[PDB]
Symmetry: D2
Subunit: 400 residues, 4 copies
Amino acid sequence: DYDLVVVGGGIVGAASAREIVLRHPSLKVAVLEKECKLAKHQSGHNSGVIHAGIYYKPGTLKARLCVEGMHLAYAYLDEKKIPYKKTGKLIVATDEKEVKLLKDLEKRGIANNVPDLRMIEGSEIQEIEPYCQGVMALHSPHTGIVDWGLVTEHYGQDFKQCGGDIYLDFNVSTETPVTIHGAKPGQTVRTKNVLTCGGLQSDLLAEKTGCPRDPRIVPFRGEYLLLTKEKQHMVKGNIYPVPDPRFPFLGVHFTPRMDGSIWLGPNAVLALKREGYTWGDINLFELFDALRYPGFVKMASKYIGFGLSEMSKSWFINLQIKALQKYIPDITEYDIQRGPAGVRAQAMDLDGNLVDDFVFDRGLAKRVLHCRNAPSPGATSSLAIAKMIADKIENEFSIG
Amino acid sequence: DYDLVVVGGGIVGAASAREIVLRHPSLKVAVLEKECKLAKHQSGHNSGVIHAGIYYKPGTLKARLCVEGMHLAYAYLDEKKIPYKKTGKLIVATDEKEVKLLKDLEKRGIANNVPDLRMIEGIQEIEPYCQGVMALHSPHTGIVDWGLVTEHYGQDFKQCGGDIYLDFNVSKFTETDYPVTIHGAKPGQTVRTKNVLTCGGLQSDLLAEKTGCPRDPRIVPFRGEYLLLTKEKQHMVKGNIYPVPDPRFPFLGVHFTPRMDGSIWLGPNAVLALKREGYTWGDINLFELFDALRYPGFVKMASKYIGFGLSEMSKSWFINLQIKALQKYIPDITEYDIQRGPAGVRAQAMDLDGNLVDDFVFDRGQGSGALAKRVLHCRNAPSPGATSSLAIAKMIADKIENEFSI
Amino acid sequence: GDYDLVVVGGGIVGAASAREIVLRHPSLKVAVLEKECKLAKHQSGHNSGVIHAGIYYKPGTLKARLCVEGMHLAYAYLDEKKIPYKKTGKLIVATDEKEVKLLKDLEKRGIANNVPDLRMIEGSEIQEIEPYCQGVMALHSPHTGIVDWGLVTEHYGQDFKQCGGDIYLDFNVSKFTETDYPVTIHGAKPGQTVRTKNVLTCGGLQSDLLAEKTGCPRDPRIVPFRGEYLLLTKEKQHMVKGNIYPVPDPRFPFLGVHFTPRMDGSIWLGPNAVLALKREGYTWGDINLFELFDALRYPGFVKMASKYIGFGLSEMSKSWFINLQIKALQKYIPDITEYDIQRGPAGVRAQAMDLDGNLVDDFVFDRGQGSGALAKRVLHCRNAPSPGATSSLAIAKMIADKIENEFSIG
Amino acid sequence: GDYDLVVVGGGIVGAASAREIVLRHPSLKVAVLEKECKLAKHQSGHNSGVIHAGIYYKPGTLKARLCVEGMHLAYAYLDEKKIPYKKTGKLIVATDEKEVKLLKDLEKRGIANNVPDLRMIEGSEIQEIEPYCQGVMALHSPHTGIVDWGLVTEHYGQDFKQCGGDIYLDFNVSKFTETDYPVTIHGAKPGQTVRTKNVLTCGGLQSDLLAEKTGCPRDPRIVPFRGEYLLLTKEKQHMVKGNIYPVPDPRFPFLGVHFTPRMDGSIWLGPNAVLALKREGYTWGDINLFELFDALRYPGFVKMASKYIGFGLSEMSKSWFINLQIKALQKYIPDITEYDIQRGPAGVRAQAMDLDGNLVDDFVFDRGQGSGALAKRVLHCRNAPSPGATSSLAIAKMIADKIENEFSI
Ligand SMILES: Cc1cc2nc3c(=O)[nH]c(=O)nc-3n(C[C@H](O)[C@H](O)[C@H](O)COP(=O)(O)OP(=O)(O)OC[C@H]3O[C@@H](n4cnc5c(N)ncnc54)[C@H](O)[C@@H]3O)c2cc1C
Ligand SMILES: Cc1cc2nc3c(=O)[nH]c(=O)nc-3n(C[C@H](O)[C@H](O)[C@H](O)COP(=O)(O)OP(=O)(O)OC[C@H]3O[C@@H](n4cnc5c(N)ncnc54)[C@H](O)[C@@H]3O)c2cc1C
Ligand SMILES: Cc1cc2nc3c(=O)[nH]c(=O)nc-3n(C[C@H](O)[C@H](O)[C@H](O)COP(=O)(O)OP(=O)(O)OC[C@H]3O[C@@H](n4cnc5c(N)ncnc54)[C@H](O)[C@@H]3O)c2cc1C
Ligand SMILES: Cc1cc2nc3c(=O)[nH]c(=O)nc-3n(C[C@H](O)[C@H](O)[C@H](O)COP(=O)(O)OP(=O)(O)OC[C@H]3O[C@@H](n4cnc5c(N)ncnc54)[C@H](O)[C@@H]3O)c2cc1C
Ligand SMILES: CCCCCCCCCCCCO[C@@H]1O[C@H](CO)[C@@H](O[C@H]2O[C@H](CO)[C@@H](O)[C@H](O)[C@H]2O)[C@H](O)[C@H]1O
Ligand SMILES: CCCCCCCCCCCCO[C@@H]1O[C@H](CO)[C@@H](O[C@H]2O[C@H](CO)[C@@H](O)[C@H](O)[C@H]2O)[C@H](O)[C@H]1O
Ligand SMILES: CCCCCCCCCCCCO[C@@H]1O[C@H](CO)[C@@H](O[C@H]2O[C@H](CO)[C@@H](O)[C@H](O)[C@H]2O)[C@H](O)[C@H]1O
Ligand SMILES: CCCCCCCCCCCCO[C@@H]1O[C@H](CO)[C@@H](O[C@H]2O[C@H](CO)[C@@H](O)[C@H](O)[C@H]2O)[C@H](O)[C@H]1O
Ligand SMILES: O=C(O)CCC(=O)C(=O)O
Ligand SMILES: O=C(O)CCC(=O)C(=O)O
Ligand SMILES: O=C(O)CCC(=O)C(=O)O
Ligand SMILES: O=C(O)CCC(=O)C(=O)O
């Protein structure tokens, strides 16, 4: 029926499908998404921050797309007149031990070409955020916030305007040259090749492939806390902490929203379910397969204490606010409301390392391909990652 | 925006909305559904059998709606030309004890006048691969895609001017000629209307508490797992083969029915689900788990029928036990001929005394406010809601006309 | 250097085994190690205390011969040592026609095993023996009785000590090491040491765990089956005069929840067959996670659960809600209710299971592989045929015969 | 009728209290009821075996005065009875500058508590006492010794029996009833009974459960904390000559995992502070649903967990994966790897907790609320100040003073 299929209606699957039709406006392309609308998971439950690229090492690949995709974003945001707001980000350090890591963030940032990286300290901290403390802080006024779920549906609007079709409520679940079946009998779409970009199910899409199970996706939920509208003037822009460089998580941070709300998060607690957006939502066969994975216990043998304290502050938010008072001490417990959350698609190898790079796997064979992982931030680098994915398309599939 | 809104895109929520607009084309009616499509839960995960009424006591409203629903169904299926197959229904009895419970069903079935029962003894001509000692021949029974006819209910509802709101998860009722306002999960998605009706099925109790209705009764999920008979032995079952069920429970037991595509599926069973929408065994929700266990009526029913609940659970853990039970009817089926298939969840209502509620349950908030008196909740409907959909719709329409003055 | 033979186990099996071996060989220096404070602290001290006559067992096997011979040896032992006992009758009652056909099989097995002296009593003559019990047909056995089997174990140790034997209490055997006496036994306490030539273990609930400390395989495995009891209050103690047993399923060694009087006049209801979540799990709450991750990971557990999990869940369900247990007992005594019962103490069965899932009921002797010192000289009795209390003296003669053959004792 | 006063509890506190009450009153028929088979089979028999000098305790308090006097009273008792002991000397190391400020606060407290020959040393002088141990600064208490408190507990019992006292072993107290001897104590066995006039219970892990039998409130409830130890191999035992303690968090009574030699020459690593899912839960898998459901339904449990859940989870994490435990130990002696240790025995702490969630470290005497014979003649010592073993002789004299005023003896 078609010539190319992109399984997954996320910001990665939409930007990759939008990029490949502007390349060649000749192929009949389709997008398969199991939910009603696009950006219903990771790209719909993110912090909304347009990252600049500070934590990443110079000369890396992750820092290449992050600085590029951020520039490609602001270009696409003005092209489509997408509402955005350049708020700026202050990476505040409390102890001197965080300052030593904060200077490593500045040294790694000057080489990634981040616009207007300034290291402030002292009374110059409150001139940008008047309610935040700290000893030293790193300023990046080029960072902004935007509705990434709104940019994702704008990617599909462009994709649909170029002869593309977005098959929604299509939950994939066969050579006829390939035919993709679904949950409803009779729901089948035939095409030449297929590219799968599932979020927390990219590992399960490998089984249809014939790919090896690894790297398995480990769900890490990121809970957000809503600050009451009474005292939201206390947060003007992004207020990030200095995280542990051993983990890709950046820590619970103060970030404004487009509607004026101030969400505090996200955290990094292990989810008992792939799509486990709530604590009580537990799937037995989805964690027994996650805990029997050889790479989990390896990482658990070294980082269990860091995961337990994330869940301890999640069970008792009085401990969470106590840590947040290091930055804004004028925040009480009666000002906090438990809001929604998102779950990360954390890839992991059998050695216990959270996968950092691109992961493309193929078994059906050769005709399929699974972007099982992409460098983060996937939302900021979306258009940049969409190019690198599109350049892996014409090679294996022989396109154009 | 509208004058009446039916919360729930199930088969009884779409049939009630279809009936209320055909009776009153002067009314702007809307339908709010949280899923993407209509009939996504109970109406889309059922055995598909067009029941005729046998297990139901004569003179009961439950027995009257099923005999009225089956004639309205075949008439509606012929009106829209929806594919259906009228298969036989043999209620086979094995032991002599099942016979004493069975000849009650015949006299109970003929009393409600179902055309046309025939007591058989000595079954290889309606079902050659089946066994037993005595059964009932119900040729008027049939299979159907209840999920497909539910979309036809919504198609008729949209043809007459009604709007179907999909991906609309009712989260909050508020006060605003349209006093009540319904809120969705997405910010900004709101609908103002005059009066509200909720047919949330599995969330009928949860939706009722948002208006002011008590926790009584509560919806207790009972999963109905199905086993798919392999393609090499689909010829062993021609029509529906039902067992002789225990009258103390509304469940009809694991039975043999073909689907519209010719596939023979074995089920469903009756097992407590640890989640309202727990279609799989691993998927459990703690707050919904403890909501069912902390209910006063749960421990009361468990104090008298836990052996039967653990009976179905043990047969679900080890399917070889389920095979030994199904071999009483067709002994030519082994563990190598079945596979794990899909399932459905029953929206079983339970009172504070542990009794599974069966009759109609309409409830509204206490007082004379806006959210009260204007929002009526249908917390339960007599089974089978799929077959009796058109008959229940006429019953619900009369309740809406009486409660909301139309 | 200490003893010639050491018996690890203070129960009725190990005590009778040590008593029998010293009576046959007065020159032997034999010792007994018990991990608890006193003899008969577990199975032998938490039982129904009924002296079985040997009805349920098939004719021709050894268990049928051991129970009847052990019962005769018991009454002569109780009369010799002046031990109190009441020869209360046993009445196996059937309530429906299905249990009648199976009770007829119990009559043929009882008359072939020569149990004195059964009679098939009709439903009209049931109250002539039990004026409150109902039923359609029953099987009477007037020569069974009740006795404090825990007290009989103390008498076995008293005879063992009066022949020169030593009983080491509070001695928890933990490891065997090589040393005239090349076997050294170590306790849990530092310095607890006993040198011996040959060891015989009757660990009961830990028979499999003791065997693995020598070189024996994990099979057979000891699966704990707790037997809970109920206390019928005094206000209705007169409704039961003797023993009222139900007609059990022949597929299981469990005899079912029965009415049994005690030596103090009490009436106990039980025991049931509840899977204990602990080797010594006498209560419903005490769980040992490691004893679960090994009892379920055993290849034979799921094989038995695949066929009889509904039977075990039935016993657990009637324990969670005793109103279901009351209705079952009302088939026999229909005028007791939930206000007349109290939860009492329980016992845990040392149920031996093979790799195929079948509950073993024969003699299982095991020793380490090879020709080492820990092997050959340490023989483990993994299982003894039930009832261990009634067949105690009979099993003791056969264990002593096995010890003489295995250890070359003059 | 039988005795004048009985002492429920075979531990070192119950034995020393019964020993003290009969030395001051030789005409008092006193008995001791112990549910186990031997004396000191729980806390008094599964401890670190250290004779504390009195460092971490606040000066001027009762807890600081009992340990200092009890240490001198014990050393005099051991020399009198010729009980073997070794003075190894404690050494508290600070690894970073954050712990050195806490270490100096321990110095000031130790000086005020009159700890003999306490000196503060640092990097150059620590290898002079412990060559294999690293660190920034150290607090050297050379008079801290080790002893077998289980052997000392039995020496208390033989002294209690020399003066006419009776020790009832395998006596599981299960029920108190009314009858010159008005109160009757019931055992777990039938007919196992004893009568007396007054009762003093030192149940340790069952301090509260014994008090509930005579009408006392549920508070304070005993919360079980397991103290796990690790056995260092005999090869590397020469690398630890004396006691090596870390700088503990002053917010908790726990002293942390420490290096400690024993009488037989073994070097044990511990104890830790993991929450036991069973009151007598000496192993990881030993749980009890009844003893746990009531442990969670206690109002103070959620409060204490609401503020210190991470400290307890970190201890459990270092016990689940011992590679994290040896890493924390390599901050002191880095030559010890995972191949040098193996899981050993453990002990359970009878930690008392109030309704607000604070770990009570003071005396808690309780009696029945009514005015009957049970509610006025059974005094329950629901908690004793830490440490119980070192302060054994000092606590016994004040417990004897309490029962002398409570019962007018
Ligand atoms: C908590 C959180 C906060 C974040 N904050 C930021 C931030 O501030 N800035 C930033 O730049 N990035 C941020 N990110 C990163 C960014 O949001 C994600 O990395 C990005 O959305 C990844 O795109 P994706 O399409 O792979 O994920 P997804 O959005 O999950 O896309 C996958 C899609 O595949 C579909 N799918 C899955 N399985 C199937 C199937 N079987 N059949 C059909 N469809 C299927 C799903 O419905 C889904 O829509 C954040 C991520 C998280 C988790
Ligand atoms: C296993 C099984 C087999 C069956 N087999 C048969 C058979 O053979 N024959 C027969 O006649 N009957 C059968 N039935 C009965 C029949 O399927 C049901 O009784 C009937 O579908 C119930 O109608 P309903 O509209 O409540 O269903 P549902 O589809 O469950 O209606 C509930 C609807 O409300 C929606 N909703 C819930 N909460 C909200 C909210 N907050 N906002 C918006 N929408 C919401 C849900 O998404 C759902 O679409 C079977 C039932 C089961 C469980
Ligand atoms: C609930 C129940 C009811 C019963 N009712 C009856 C009845 O009515 N009539 C009848 O005839 N029979 C009855 N029996 C059977 C009888 O009670 C037992 O079969 C018999 O007691 C088994 O003897 P034993 O010594 O092997 O058991 P146990 O007494 O359990 O023997 C094990 C002993 O070894 C010790 N031990 C274990 N490991 C070690 C170690 N490492 N070191 C040292 N010591 C150790 C234990 O402390 C214990 O003392 C009943 C059994 C049960 C469980
Ligand atoms: C791991 C650990 C390490 C320690 N290390 C040290 C150290 O280095 N130095 C130091 O000075 N202190 C130390 N201590 C403290 C000291 O060991 C204890 O505080 C001390 O044993 C308390 O005395 P006790 O009698 O209450 O103890 P316990 O021995 O626990 O006293 C309770 C006694 O009462 C009995 N009992 C309970 N209920 C009943 C009943 N119903 N009927 C009859 N008897 C009953 C018990 O069997 C037990 O014998 C340590 C404690 C622990 C847990
Ligand atoms: C395998 C079983 C589960 C183990 C899982 C391992 C996951 C590891 C998660 C790493 C933690 C998440 O990321 C972690 O976030 C915390 C909390 O914001 C940051 O913490 C930092 O910022 C917070 C503010 O939020 C300050 O209060 C805090 O003092 C400071 O340390 C850490 O610097 C960062 O490392
Ligand atoms: C844990 C708490 C559980 C709460 C308990 C409430 C749930 C109780 C469920 C009982 C109802 C299940 O429904 C029950 O299905 C079984 C199995 O199909 C039927 O059983 C019948 O058919 C089966 C085959 O299908 C035959 O093997 C069987 O001999 C016959 O009785 C029963 O007649 C019916 O009563
Ligand atoms: C590891 C797998 C799970 C455990 C495996 C199964 C172990 C348990 C086997 C069944 C338990 C023992 O089974 C025992 O005998 C039968 C059932 O067989 C019952 O026997 C009797 O029960 C009651 C009387 O008390 C009567 O109403 C009943 O008709 C009759 O059968 C006993 O009450 C029961 O105690
Ligand atoms: C009821 C649920 C709530 C959980 C209950 C809370 C329990 C609190 C337990 C406190 C922790 C135990 O006590 C704690 O031991 C650790 C580890 O030895 C000590 O830690 C110290 O010593 C260790 C090694 O011994 C060093 O590696 C470490 O850097 C240093 O801080 C802490 O200083 C002490 O505070
Ligand atoms: O898990 C993370 O910290 C990465 C998500 C992110 O980019 C953010 O929230 O700012
Ligand atoms: O057994 C039930 O619960 C009713 C479902 C039904 O109607 C059927 O499967 O035929
Ligand atoms: O029923 C059992 O499991 C055997 C126990 C026994 O011998 C009895 O209670 O009589
Ligand atoms: O719990 C503790 O750490 C205190 C017990 C003690 O004195 C020790 O182990 O040194």
